[PDB]
Design a protein around this ligand. Structure first.
Ligand SMILES: CNC(=O)[C@@H](NC(=O)[C@H](OCc1ccc(-c2ccsc2)cc1)[C@H](O)[C@@H](O)[C@@H](OCc1ccc(-c2ccsc2)cc1)C(=O)N[C@H](C(=O)NC)C(C)C)C(C)C
Lengths: 99, 99
């Protein structure tokens, strides 16, 4: 669909069978989700943004559904104030910025 | 144009007569630019990012060209890693997310 930016581009995502609200963030290299449990091994990682760095846990090969579209990729879990769907997954659903 | 997200959506912007690279950031409510000189008085503003909050200087009615599209709006200047073009300006250039 076509999402306007008058409001934050929040969409519903399905991950781990859980429905969550996440932000489609073209400014995010990675996908960062709030603290949650994911299966498998993870690697510690520091990701920076506005305000500095936060420590997150990196999970690879994670399946996420974004507006019906399935996508696979790395997901970072940590104390982020909002769920962020970064470019690593936006590319997988054919998301493009247009004007 | 149509921008894919396999790489950061960096574009050249023109502000204060200078060229700078900035990120088309749908995850940003506001436009935040790296430390620079702008005219007029500024007002304080606290903005939150993934790593916490930062104090920024808010300048209003600032002329900024984004990929040839002239925009005039609020710009925040502060300790940001990269120049961020947020929704306040993305909407002025008719930018939308599509997939
Ligand atoms: C490599 N690192 C990245 O790609 C990071 N990208 C960014 O931080 C983007 O910023 C460009 C950016 C790119 C590279 C580096 C970088 C780092 C190290 S080397 C390069 C630093 C910054 C991003 O889209 C921000 O803009 C936006 O983050 C989402 C967000 C939205 C609402 C709240 C939130 C907070 C309180 S309630 C909701 C909290 C967070 C955000 O902070 N939005 C703010 C906002 O809208 N707040 C409401 C806005 C005022 C700036 C990833 C890991 C998240």
């Amino acid at each position: 669909p076509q999402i306007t930016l008058w409001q934050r581009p929040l969409v519903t995502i399905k991950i781990g069978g859980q429905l969550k609200e996440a932000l489609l963030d073209t400014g995010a290299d990675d996908t960062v989700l709030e603290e949650m449990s994911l299966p498998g091994r993870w690697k510690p990682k520091m990701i920076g943004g506005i305000g500095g760095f936060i420590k997150v846990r990196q999970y690879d090969q994670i399946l996420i559904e974004i507006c019906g579209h399935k996508a696979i990729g790395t997901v970072l879990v940590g104390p982020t104030p909002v769920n962020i769907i970064g470019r690593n997954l936006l590319t997988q659903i054919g998301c493009t910025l247009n004007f």
